[PDB]
Structure 1
Amino acid sequence: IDPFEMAVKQLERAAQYMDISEEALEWLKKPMRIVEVSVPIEMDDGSVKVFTGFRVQHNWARGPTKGGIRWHPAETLSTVKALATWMTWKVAVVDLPYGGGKGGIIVNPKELSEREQERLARAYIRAVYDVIGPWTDIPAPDVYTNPKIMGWMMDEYETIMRRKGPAFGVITGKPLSIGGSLGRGTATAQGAIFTIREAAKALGIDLKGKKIAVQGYGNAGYYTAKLAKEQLGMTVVAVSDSRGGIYNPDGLDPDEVLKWKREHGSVKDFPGATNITNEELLELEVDVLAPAAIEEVITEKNADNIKAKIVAEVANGPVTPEADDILREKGILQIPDFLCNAGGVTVSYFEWVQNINGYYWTEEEVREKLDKKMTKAFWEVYNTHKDKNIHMRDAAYVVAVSRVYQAMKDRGWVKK
């Protein structure tokens, strides 16, 4: 419906700037496999309740599909399909041997007990086994899911398969004790920091002690701020929660800010920092801007007021296309959404490789591989930007669609 057609429109707009056949557009619009199943679980009161689960594999030309699992009561088939379609290009931009996947269950996990959550995960695996697997489809943790549900799902898959193949490789995000990989928690933030550093290098800006402003102080935002201040040595000047933001021109320490937020429930009234609104934080005179909160954070109203030279949107599509055009005409380099949060999927791919090979890498090795892959992806996007004279979002979309088209043409799926 709405999200699926929005993704289709985005794909059309992307193809407007590159040469691919019409049959390729039609093949890419329709996801290859849609699996809608009924997931029954014996509730704690003794009754049996059935939920609706969706597994959407949009494409697998480049390799086994990869996709997160969402447990949200508002989840719909169109949303899962659109997210799988986006995940296709998310894994394509990084140049991974992955296709686009997505999973979801129509359920609210707030009132589900731990036994009920375990039963839900195991029954979902029992229902979707026939269309998943280490070489076929790799589920991942996503919103309202944590590595414990991943452990339960992996255990169920291993039990059903009778331990014939690499069970640990069927899914990602598993705990470090069982098939885990290092750097998973800070994966998205680490990729974002690498992209920020690379954009600064491309623009000729050294980031020694300069201004970075993060709008949104969740796990991803806190990790991004801490990693920036540590590796890049930049001056974190503003962080905001769902309530308000705190600004200090001298700098901030993300550790103490997170401690204060945990203790008081918010970052409001932080010592040495003036309380400011989210819109004021978005319009600060900084060099790097990273929105880590609710999407559509920047619109036409405030796009013209943005002065940060580098905008790394870690959030999923937090900037409207009109605001994208406004930032483009303002001389602002804006890192696309799936070119920023791609660190999570890159480290998930690393975890999958570790699971298959039976060899687990150290923190430094995972960091090095993530750096290489993410820098190469961003540099390819920036080169296409400077070549085709098209937006960063447009360049990343063109690269991803070109890779998918080449994979499909090599497989013989499309003759032209």
Structure 2
Amino acid sequence: VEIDPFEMAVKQLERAAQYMDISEEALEWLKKPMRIVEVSVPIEMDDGSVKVFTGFRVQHNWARGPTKGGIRWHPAETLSTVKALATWMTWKVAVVDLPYGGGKGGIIVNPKELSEREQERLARAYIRAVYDVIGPWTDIPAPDVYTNPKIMGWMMDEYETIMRRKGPAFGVITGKPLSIGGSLGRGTATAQGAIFTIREAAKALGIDLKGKKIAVQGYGNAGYYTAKLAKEQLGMTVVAVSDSRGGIYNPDGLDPDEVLKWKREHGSVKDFPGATNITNEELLELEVDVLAPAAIEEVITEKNADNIKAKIVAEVANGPVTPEADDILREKGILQIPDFLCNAGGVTVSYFEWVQNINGYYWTEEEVREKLDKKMTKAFWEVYNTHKDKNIHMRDAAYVVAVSRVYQAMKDRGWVKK
């Protein structure tokens, strides 16, 4: 990464607090995670040896309620990345008005080198390590990069075993399989929220999205579903997709299902029939109408900020654009959906699932879809009007919408007097 993920996040927070009335003590409180837990996660490998990984559970603030955030399994992960993600989580849950704080977890591991049994052991050992700081009313993890509902169910089972079934164990973690307390629409949650935000942004810009072009970076749970929903709901034409090994571009358009099948049968989207192999750098520079980065953070910097040619940049990923790059893009007249507003659908449906678990009652697809649409539209329009009234960068406006709420919570708790 170009710069430290946490330093960048703090930079953004200050840059955006320059447009609002907030006390110095509150800013100092908000620039530091409230609790960080670094743990050793020992598991037994398939050959019988014991290997110790490094796990992080960072909650940045819980003024508004129990902290929420996914668990990332990544070899390149660092504690700074988890801190930045928890900080972004805070604003993410504040902007769509959820009774959550901000949290994040992670393990420095390459899951592609682990078997099924090793992955289950890793999840259970991580739960055993961080049990003392998580709970249905303390900290609610969720799926993230290289984690899936399978691992979520393993973690929930381990937590329930430790907790001796005293309370709503199903609510300790979200993104679970439907059989063990799952939620309908959670699989396509972040993609649905991103699609709703893109539709609202096009409405604001007066652009008909039918027949237009979308380029998606990353083909995971968010990128693939974003491409599929854009092709299906918005009528867009997916011209290029990518994963860590490279991307495929096609002027005539790609079918997301065939690309996903090829990726599953080959390991990557590279060399897909009828498409041209390109790099992620080349995909980011393509002439498209919507660009959706749904991969690792910090993909747009001063090394390519001026080469972006998309009308709308939908930051599906967490912090994919640097503040400098934000300034360059805004100078270029490119509308940006802020990272913690565009992909707030995923946590929006995660909040729904938590409510369904603690209540003991479950809803349907239509209710979840309706509530998610309502929440995402309200949050996006709040941020848009905020940035329009104050004549500031989108990113900043969302902060003004988010941080203020968090700020209010502290003033309602007595944490900060001013």
2:182 counterpart SS class? coil
1:114 to partner: Cα distance: 3.5
Cα deviation per residue 1:123-172 (whole Å; 9 max; x = unaligned)? 33233222211111101122232222221221122222221211100111
CA shift, 1:118, in A, is 3.0
Per-residue CA deviation, residues 1-40 of structure 1 (Å, 9 max, x unaligned), is: 9443333222222211211000101111222222333444
Query: 1:238-277 alignment to 2 at 5 Å?
Result: 238-277=240-279
Aligned residues: 416
CA distance in 1, matches of 2:271, 2:145: 29
Distance 2:277 2:127 in 1: 47
Question: 2:69, 2:86 within 8 Å by CA — same for their partners in 1?
Answer: yes
TM score, norm. by length of structure 2: 0.91
Q: 1:268 to 1:35 in 2, by over 3 A?
A: closer
CA spacing shift, 1:70–1:216, aligned 2, 3 Å: closer
Shift of 1:197: 0.2
Whole-angstrom CA distance in 2 between matches of 1:271 and 1:114: 31
Deviation string, structure 1 residues 44-84 (Cα, Å, up to 9, x no partner): 55555544433222111111001222333454433322221
Task: Give the Å deviation of 1:377.
Answer: 1.0
Task: Tell whether the 8 Å contact from 2:249 to 2:277 is kept in structure 1 after alignment.
Answer: yes
User: Offset at 1:357?
Assistant: 1.3
**2:339 aligns to what SS in structure 1?**
coil
2:16 to 3, 9, 14: 14
Measured after TM superposition, the shift of residue 336 of structure 1 is 1.5
Change (3 A) 1:154 1:217: closer
Q: Tell me which moved more, 257-266 or 40-49.
A: 40-49
SS of match in other structure, 2:105: strand
Range 313-322 or range 383-392, more displaced = 313-322
Distance 1:260 1:406, change over 3 A: same
Q: Give the corresponding residue for 2:104.
A: 102
Q: Distance in 2 between matches of 1:276 and 1:7?
A: 30
**3-state secondary structure, aligned to 1:141:** coil
Is the alpha carbon distance of 1:73 and 1:326 closer, same or farther for their aligned partners in structure 2, counting shifts above 3 Å?
Answer: closer
| 1:197–1:149 distance in 2 versus 1, CA, 3 Å | same
Q: CA deviation at 1:225?
A: 1.3
TM-score for both structures, normalised by structure 1: 0.91
Instruction: Report Cα offsets for 1:164-190 as digits up to 9, x if no partner.
Output: 211100111111110111222221111
Residue 208 of structure 1 and its aligned partner are, at CA, apart by 2.2
Distance 1:175 1:302, change over 3 A: same
Change over 3 Å in CA distance of 1:249–1:105 after alignment to 2: closer
Taking a change above 3 Å as real, the CA distance of residues 260 and 403 of structure 1, as seen in their structure-2 partners, is same
Cα separation, partners in 2 of 1:216 and 1:158, compared to 1, 3 Å:
closer
Partner SS state of residue 253, structure 2: coil
1:333, distance to aligned residue in structure 2 (A): 0.7
Unaligned runs of 5+ in 2: none
d(CA) in 2 for partners of 1:349, 1:206: 32
Alignment CA distance shift 1:132-1:242 (3 Å): closer
The Cα of 1:219 is off from its aligned counterpart by: 3.6
Q: 1:16 to 1:105 in 2, by over 3 A?
A: same
Q: Aligned partners of 1:324 and 1:313: how far apart in 2?
A: 11
| Structure 1 position 334, deviation (Å) | 0.9
Residue 285 of structure 1 aligns to a residue in which SS? coil
| 2:8–2:323 contact (8 Å) kept in structure 1 | no
User: 2:85 touches 2:318 (CA, 8 Å); kept in 1?
Assistant: no
The residue matched to 1:182 in structure 2 has which SS?
A: coil
Q: Which moved more, 1:177-186 or 1:245-254?
A: 245-254
Moved more, 138-147 or 36-45: 36-45
Q: Secondary structure at the match of 1:339?
A: helix
Measure the CA separation in 2 of the matches of 1:231 and 1:198: 13
Gaps of 5+ in 1: none
> Could you say if the C-alpha distance between residues 248 and 373 of structure 1 is closer, same or farther in structure 2, counting changes exceeding 3 Å?
same
CA distance in 1, matches of 2:275, 2:74: 36
Query: Residues of 1 paired with 2:100 and 2:90: CA distance?
Result: 8
Q: Percent identity?
A: 100
Q: Secondary structure at the match of 1:179?
A: coil
More divergent stretch after superposition (267-276 vs 384-393): 267-276
SS in 2 for 1:58: strand
**What is the alpha-carbon distance in structure 2 between the residues aligned to residue 74 and residue 255 of structure 1?**
29
Answer yes or no: is the 8 Å Cα contact 2:298–2:320 preserved in 1: yes
| Residues 89-141 of structure 1: CA deviation (Å, up to 9, x unaligned) | 12112211110112233444445444443333333323322221111110112
Deviations 1:327-386 (A, max 9, x none): 211221111122222221111111111111111122222111111111111111101110
Distance between the aligned counterparts of 1:179 and 1:217, measured in 2?
A: 27
1:293 deviates by 3.5
CA distance in 1, matches of 2:220, 2:47: 35
